[PDB]
Design a binder for these strands. Structure first.
Ligand code: MG
Ligand code: MG
Ligand code: MG
Ligand code: MG
Ligand code: MG
Ligand code: MG
Ligand code: MG
Ligand code: MG
Ligand code: MG
Ligand code: MG
Ligand code: MG
Ligand code: MG
Ligand code: MG
Ligand code: MG
Ligand code: MG
Ligand code: MG
Ligand code: MG
Ligand code: MG
Lengths: 139, 190, 252, 201, 109, 175
RNA sequence: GGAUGAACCGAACGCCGGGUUAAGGCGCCCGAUGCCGACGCUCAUCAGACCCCAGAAAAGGUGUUGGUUGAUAUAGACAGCA
RNA sequence: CAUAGCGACGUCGCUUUUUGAUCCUUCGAUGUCGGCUCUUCCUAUCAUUGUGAAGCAGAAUUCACCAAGCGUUGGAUUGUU
RNA sequence: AGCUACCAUCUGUGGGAUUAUGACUGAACGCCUCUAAGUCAGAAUCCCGCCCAGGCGGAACGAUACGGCAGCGCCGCGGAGCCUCGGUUGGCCUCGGAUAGCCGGUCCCCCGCCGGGGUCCGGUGCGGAGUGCCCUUCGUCCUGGGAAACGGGGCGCGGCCGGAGAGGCGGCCGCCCCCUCGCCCGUCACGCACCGCACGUUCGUGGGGAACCUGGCGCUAAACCAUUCGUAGACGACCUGCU
């Protein structure tokens, strides 16, 4: 049933807290509630971190547990987690949320105009397809 | 204490297959199909092999009470496998001191009439659970045979018969009469 | 402290609003449970208490002292002229209860039936249902009636017939007939609607509703006794003769 | 807000949802709770039934017709629960109580409208998965409610009609996706604006 | 042309459990449900707009039934985005649960 | 004594010199306290219990926080303590996993309060020691000694239950 | 503030505006946690829920959770079957 | 044969249907015993329903559980309770 | 005659969840176990039914005021206005649900050309996303390029269909009459530009009440008192009758 697991080398996304919006690697597990956590390439120094503010991703790095920053950083850079992360639908959904949030009034006006025209064209095509499908006569 | 993982694996015979639809186990074998859902238990069920058909039950972060359910689910699945491969047969004996218990098996083994229990004129009608067939043994003089695929249904029907034949307002250590399950086994003895 | 000796309560608390009935006819309040396997039939009837007498009959109760013996038994005579069916009501089941969906009345409502709709028949212009009966003749009203019957057929769970008694056949003073919703049981809604529709304007004799030597229920209003005290009303014990302010009372 | 807030009672905990609803109607908001038979109560069914039977026992000894009115419908039970969190003996509380409607099942005004959900009152997130719970509909039925069967039948008809409507909506949305694929050279100019400003990933 | 004011609800007066300070009111602004989101609305003008029986003079318009009690947001209240408002006259108690307009007027953006 | 996130303090004290011993011995303790004021108070409590010293007859020559020498390493802590129950005094040995010794002692205080209703004034921490993973005795601690540890997060409860307060979609607990 | 209360806890009082607290609180009544609060314990077919205070004991439980002491065990424990 | 049924020596409680102890309310007045009448409530269950146990063969009885729905009477003597 | 008596006679009822308890399967604790998860039977108790009353609670249906000016109903947003009550300041027209799992799409089997299964392919910190979607208001005049041109408007008519849980709603056709305008990007200038300022901007032709005018199409009734009854009764009320 489960596909994403808490384990050494698993890359997690920080949902909230001081490090929200960042990627980290799980270096070790502490007492079912916390994990020794290290983002050497995403600017999260080694520290404890609760599992509540983690959202596991699909990337697993291969380093032994409680390895140093050097080995975590080499595991991160080789098979680059930054670009592979940015390529995912998750990361660009986050990016779309951010750029929708930072949109100004003129940008909202332009989006309103473009969306108006786009919706009208799509609706005309939908009506055309409906009438094309309404010409069915078969016993 | 919360245990990280408690898992138990059940081997599936070759002539029976098991399908998972969430936590609903469908076991199809030579003798029929048994379907049972375990949605009241938060476990993870998986089919491992394409060769020998192991079924694994996993419980993650379970305390003492919910670690007890893994082997319960495994035993229920094994009973389903046993029912669809060999079936379940319960043999009951009617014991009496003076009045012989006359048992008449009505339509298709689904109804049982007890006539002369302790000599009284009340007729006891007991309806078997669906899928359970009652019959009169041809090997012993006072013996009922209950056959089915579901162990709970077969044993529930047997318990219905046993509780229907109950002495009242008497010393039951002396009035030993009634129909009691003599043995529990399978059909086909394989 | 507890009462010194035990004694059962006087009267039943199951009839507590010991008041004048708000109705004179006596309403059914529960019709027999409908099962579609039965043939289509009516569930009730209206009669008039004529009087009492007694009969002599032989009893066929084995093991009894009066087996194959003559007994004298009191009987009540209930005069039952045929009912006349003048309408159909459909009901629909809702999570708030049964509710009246649609009522369809027959043409040619009898004069004694129309008397029921008027408090003062003498001064009336007798105008009831005069515009309604016109819709049984025109094509538009007939189409509306067919739509109403179809709506009853496809939306109603139980249907009832409005039936009235026939005052003209009774020796009473009253000419104002009695109306009643009698439930039609025993079939599909379409079957009972067709049956009730063919019975419109027609007469239903009591032998088509009830049979010989079957046990029925009688619903009605009892004889009025006026304002009564506790001794005659709840049958409490009379206080001793030495009681000062009256003895036909409840002491505490 | 200014519209009517329609909340689906299925899967919701009684007191949690009632606290939310009471605060909403006190803030001058129209609230309509539908499908009150689907409301859950934490704790096992026998315990909750015992609580309601104790409530049934509480009656005025001198004249029970004046006493506490024990309402047996699930909608009325939830209504009384909300009244217990409202200051219903003042004009403000009575107006707040008037701003609330409760129903068993989903009646025709509201079966054709979208229904909200309160996560802070949902059983799935507010209750541990191993704990037991009771259904308000079953409790009401076994404590005196009369319309469990007819409400179930009408709910099943409503669900069939909703399935038909949902199939129509799915077919329309499939046709819309096909239309977007059909016209893309005349759409990409505005699609790029939307993508640039974060709409439409 | 457009709404141009934020919707708020007159939730009640500043109060203890058994004491009520009617001179200051509590407003629930729609869409503001955290204390840190209230900083925008601090100092903004707010109006309780209502109708009555007699006509009153309208600035830049003909007399009508509309009347206003003016006020402004003073500070945040609670953690859940309440605000406190001081009006020129204390708000009537019939306005509880009714519309207040936050007018964006003293803009700082 | 209340709590917070406790800190370790090295507290060194001694009696005041008298014309009986010009150089009284120096005594050192580890005190886990919210702050240095409470640390000094607990030092005086403990040395009054052990030696025959008082705050008035002695002085505190040093009170400094002890920083963890490896806060980036998960390690096992055994704690020997004693506490007063409602009906007696008991010695306990408890095990925890944490990065810091002070964090482990804070975990101990919370756990004693949770399981035995023991308030912090009843608890006397008498030894704290980092132990090897083979020397551990508590299975709840030992089960995390897996080089290939692996578990999911089965039933993730929605914590943002009020943003939004009202919504059309029901939450998902599977991730 | 303790729902309520001569005596409890805070604090003593001219008429007011603003700020901040005490004791006590912050699901809703009812101002305030609508914190992505922390760690555990607990299921009650009479659960529990805050000084005074408004109800309980001895004695038990193979319910569950910790802890103390002791003992057996690949020279094969323990439990089952013989 | 301690514990079917009992329970010495001790010891922990519950109740307010006994009688005390106290004197807070009432002395510009709360009509003071018993019976009769009438309603309701409690359960620490006499009977009845459904059960468990016995030194329960049957019959009768005894102990206990869920349980207050229903019932618990007619008289001689006495103001009596 | 009436009233009346265990001093005569007649009638008195069905389910459900379950308690105690006895069990089934089954772990915990390679055995056992009625229990932990899951099941069964189960009662003068409990709830409901039957029965009594019937909400400041509803429904369906009937008739709805004259022979004289005399009242009323519907249709027209038809007009001119009064009196009073104020709220509000875009809409969302809907799967069922699961949560130790979901959602979308597609090829083969089965049921009326649409659905249900088995594959297979996608998405899943929900993007076929309520952290969402839709509509989007300055108005016109020259004036080009794109979208459309199988298109929009009709308080325009007539017809059909769906919706009954409270349908008070929604959808589709036929005729006729308009403009090629409304949607995007451009060209072109203009409108009180009321000289910094609030209640502005909607629902809205709002709700409710009296009244005037204007036309069309329609209706001509009951209740109560008085009288009578006596199935009723303190009085009211109730059951009744009256070319
Ligand atoms: Mg016997
Ligand atoms: Mg008695
Ligand atoms: Mg006298
Ligand atoms: Mg006070
Ligand atoms: Mg108190
Ligand atoms: Mg003090
Ligand atoms: Mg002040
Ligand atoms: Mg409070
Ligand atoms: Mg509040
Ligand atoms: Mg004194
Ligand atoms: Mg007096
Ligand atoms: Mg008196
Ligand atoms: Mg008892
Ligand atoms: Mg009774
Ligand atoms: Mg009699
Ligand atoms: Mg076994
Ligand atoms: Mg049991
Ligand atoms: Mg059962």
């Amino acid at each position: 049933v489960f596909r994403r697991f808490v384990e050494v080398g698993r890359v997690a996304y920080v949902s909230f807290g001081p490090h929200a919006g960042k990627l980290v690697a799980i270096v070790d597990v502490i007492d079912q509630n916390r994990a020794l956590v290290d983002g050497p390439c995403t600017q999260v120094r080694r520290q404890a971190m609760p599992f509540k503010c983690m959202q596991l991703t699909d990337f697993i790095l291969k380093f032994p547990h409680s390895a140093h920053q050097k080995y975590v950083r080499q595991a991160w850079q080789k098979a680059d987690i930054n670009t592979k992360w940015a390529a995912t639908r998750w990361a660009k959904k986050i990016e779309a949320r951010e750029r929708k949030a930072k949109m100004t009034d003129f940008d909202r006006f332009k989006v309103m105009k473009a969306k108006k025209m786009r919706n009208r064209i799509i609706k005309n095509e939908v009506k055309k397809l409906q009438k094309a499908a309404l010409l069915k006569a078969s016993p | 204490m919360k245990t990280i993982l408690s898992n138990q694996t059940v081997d599936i015979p070759e002539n029976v297959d098991i399908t998972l639809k969430g936590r609903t186990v469908i076991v199809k074998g030579p003798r029929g199909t048994l379907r049972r859902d375990f949605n009241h238990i938060n476990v993870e069920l998986s089919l491992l092999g394409k060769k020998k058909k192991r079924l694994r039950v996993d419980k993650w972060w379970g305390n003492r009470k919910e670690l007890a359910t893994v082997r319960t689910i495994c035993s229920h699945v094994q009973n389903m496998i046993k029912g669809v491969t060999l079936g379940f047969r319960y043999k009951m004996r009617s014991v009496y001191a003076h009045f012989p218990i006359n048992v008449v098996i009505q339509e298709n083994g689904s109804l049982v009439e007890i006539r002369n229990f302790l000599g009284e004129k009340y007729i006891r009608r007991v309806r078997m659970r669906p899928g359970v067939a009652c019959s009169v043994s041809q090997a012993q003089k006072d013996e009922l045979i209950l056959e089915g695929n579901d162990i709970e249904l077969v044993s529930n029907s047997a318990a219905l018969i046993q509780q229907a034949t109950t002495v009242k307002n008497k010393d039951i250590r002396k009035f030993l009469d009634g129909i009691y399950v003599s043995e529990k086994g399978t059909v086909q003895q394989a | 402290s507890h009462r010194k000796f035990s004694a059962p309560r006087h009267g039943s608390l199951g009839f507590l609003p010991r008041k004048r009935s708000s109705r004179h006819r006596g309403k059914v309040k529960s019709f027999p449970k409908d099962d579609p396997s039965k043939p289509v039939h009516l569930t009730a009837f209206l009669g008039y208490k004529a009087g009492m007498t007694h009969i002599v009959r032989e009893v066929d109760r084995p093991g009894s002292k009066v087996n194959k013996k003559e007994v004298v038994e009191a009987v009540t005579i209930v005069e039952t002229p045929p009912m006349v069916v003048v309408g159909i009501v459909g009901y629909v089941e809702t999570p708030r209860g049964l509710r009246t969906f649609k009522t369809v009345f027959a043409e040619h409502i009898s004069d004694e039936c129309k008397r029921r709709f008027y408090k003062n028949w003498h001064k009336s212009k007798k105008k009831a249902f005069t515009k309604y009966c016109k819709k049984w003749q025109d094509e538009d009203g007939k189409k509306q009636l067919e739509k109403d019957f179809s709506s009853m057929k496809k939306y109603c769970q139980v249907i009832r017939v409005i039936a009235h008694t026939q005052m003209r056949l009774l020796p009473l003073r009253q000419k104002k007939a009695h109306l009643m919703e009698i439930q039609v049981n025993g079939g599909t809604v379409a079957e009972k609607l067709d049956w009730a529709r063919e019975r419109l304007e027609q007469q239903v004799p009591v032998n088509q509703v009830f049979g010989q030597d079957e046990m029925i229920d009688v619903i009605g209003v009892t004889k009025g006794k006026g304002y009564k005290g506790v001794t005659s009303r709840w049958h409490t014990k009379k206080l001793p003769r030495k009681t000062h302010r009256g003895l036909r009372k409840v002491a505490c | 807000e200014v519209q009517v807030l329609v909340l689906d009672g299925r899967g919701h905990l009684l007191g949690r949802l009632a606290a939310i609803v009471a605060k909403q109607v006190l803030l001058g908001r129209k609230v309509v709770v539908v499908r009150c038979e689907g409301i859950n109560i934490s704790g096992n069914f026998y315990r909750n039934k015992l609580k309601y039977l104790a409530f049934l026992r509480k009656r005025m000894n001198t004249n029970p017709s004046r006493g506490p009115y024990h309402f047996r419908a699930p909608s009325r039970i939830f209504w009384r629960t909300v009244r217990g969190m409202l200051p219903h003996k003042t004009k403000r509380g009575q107006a707040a109580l008037d701003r609330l409607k409760v129903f068993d099942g989903i009646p025709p005004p509201y079966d054709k409208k979208k229904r909200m959900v309160v996560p802070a009152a949902l059983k799935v997130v507010r209750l541990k998965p191993t704990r037991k719970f009771a259904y308000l509909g079953r409790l009401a039925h076994e404590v005196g409610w009369k319309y469990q069967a007819v409400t179930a039948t009408l709910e099943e008809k409503r669900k069939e009609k909703a399935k038909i409507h949902y199939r129509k909506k799915k077919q329309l949305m499939r046709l819309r996706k096909q239309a977007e694929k059909n016209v893309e050279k005349k759409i990409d100019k505005y699609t790029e604006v939307l993508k640039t400003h974060g709409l439409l990933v | 042309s457009g709404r141009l004011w934020s919707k708020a609800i007159f939730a009640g007066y500043k109060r203890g459990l058994r004491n009520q300070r009617e001179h200051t009111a509590l407003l629930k602004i729609e869409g503001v449900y955290a204390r840190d989101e209230t900083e925008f609305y601090l100092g903004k003008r707010c109006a309780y707009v209502y109708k009555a029986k007699n006509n009153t003079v309208t600035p830049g318009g003909k007399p009508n039934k509309t009347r206003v009690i003016w006020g402004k947001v003073t500070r945040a209240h609670g953690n859940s985005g309440m605000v406190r408002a001081k009006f020129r006259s204390n708000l009537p108690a019939k306005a509880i649960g009714h519309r207040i307009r936050v007018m964006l007027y003293p803009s700082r953006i | 004594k209340a709590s917070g996130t406790l800190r370790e303090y090295k507290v060194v004290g001694r009696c005041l010199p008298t014309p009986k011993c010009h150089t009284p011995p120096l005594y050192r303790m580890r005190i886990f306290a919210p702050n240095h004021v409470v640390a000094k108070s607990r030092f005086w409590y403990f040395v009054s219990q052990l030696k025959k010293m008082k705050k008035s007859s002695g002085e505190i020559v040093y009170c400094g926080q002890v920083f963890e020498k490896s806060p980036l390493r998960v390690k096992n802590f055994g704690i020997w303590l004693r506490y007063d129950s409602r009906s007696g005094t008991h010695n306990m040995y408890r095990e925890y996993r944490d990065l810091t010794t002070a964090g482990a002692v804070t975990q101990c205080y919370r756990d004693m309060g949770a399981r035995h209703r023991a308030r912090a004034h009843s608890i006397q921490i008498m030894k704290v020691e980092e132990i090897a993973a083979s020397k551990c005795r508590r299975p709840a601690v030992k089960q995390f000694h897996d080089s290939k540890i692996k578990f999911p997060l089965p039933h993730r409860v929605l914590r943002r239950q009020h943003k939004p307060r009202f919504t059309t979609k029901r939450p998902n607990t599977f991730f």
